[PDB]
Amino acid sequence: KNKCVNFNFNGLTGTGVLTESNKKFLPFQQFGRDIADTTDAVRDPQTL
Amino acid sequence: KNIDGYFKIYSKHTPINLVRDLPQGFSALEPLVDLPIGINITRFQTLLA
Ligand SMILES: *[C@@H]1O[C@H](CO)[C@@H](O)[C@H](O)[C@H]1NC(C)=O
């Protein structure tokens, strides 16, 4: 966390800084998105 | 609803004071389960007790 890394989470390949988000996702809701429609946040499939 | 062999169900349960018909208000429906049944469904029934 708090570092620039290349991450592939649940088949989703991306590069960015991983931080803990204060947003509360529903159990089913996973991928968050901003106005730009790019992925804002994801969920760790191993340890949720 | 069923699309592309994948069934989708959306469940919301909240208490309300109602007599008949439907109350006028807003509600946000959320999913319930995930059922990849993949079968043709042309009819449905409502079970009662
Ligand atoms: C489902 O079966 C009914 C009756 O045979 C048919 O009219 C309908 O087109 C079928 N739908 C699909 C998606 O195959």
Side-chain angles (χ1 to χ4, degrees):
Chain A
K1 293 177 179 178
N2 290 282
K3 294 176 179 177
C4 181
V5 294
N6 188 340
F7 59 91
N8 188 340
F9 294 161
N10 194 341
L12 177 63
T13 299
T15 300
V17 176
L18 296 174
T19 58
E20 183 178 2
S21 178
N22 291 336
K23 295 175 180 177
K24 294 176 179 177
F25 298 164
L26 295 176
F28 296 159
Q29 294 299 320
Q30 185 174 355
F31 295 160
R33 293 184 181 276
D34 59 9
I35 297 170
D37 290 344
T38 59
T39 300
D40 182 67
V42 294
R43 180 182 63 196
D44 184 5
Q46 186 173 355
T47 299
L48 297 175
Chain B
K1 61 180 293 180
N2 189 340
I3 292 171
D4 190 4
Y6 177 78
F7 177 80
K8 295 176 180 177
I9 184 168
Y10 299 132
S11 176
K12 182 181 172 62
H13 182 63
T14 57
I16 193 65
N17 188 339
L18 178 64
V19 177
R20 299 289 181 269
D21 289 344
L22 294 174
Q24 185 173 354
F26 178 82
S27 296
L29 297 173
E30 63 184 343
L32 178 62
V33 296
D34 292 344
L35 297 176
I37 303 301
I39 60 177
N40 179 354
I41 299 182
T42 60
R43 293 182 182 175
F44 59 90
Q45 294 177 336
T46 299
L47 295 174
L48 294 173

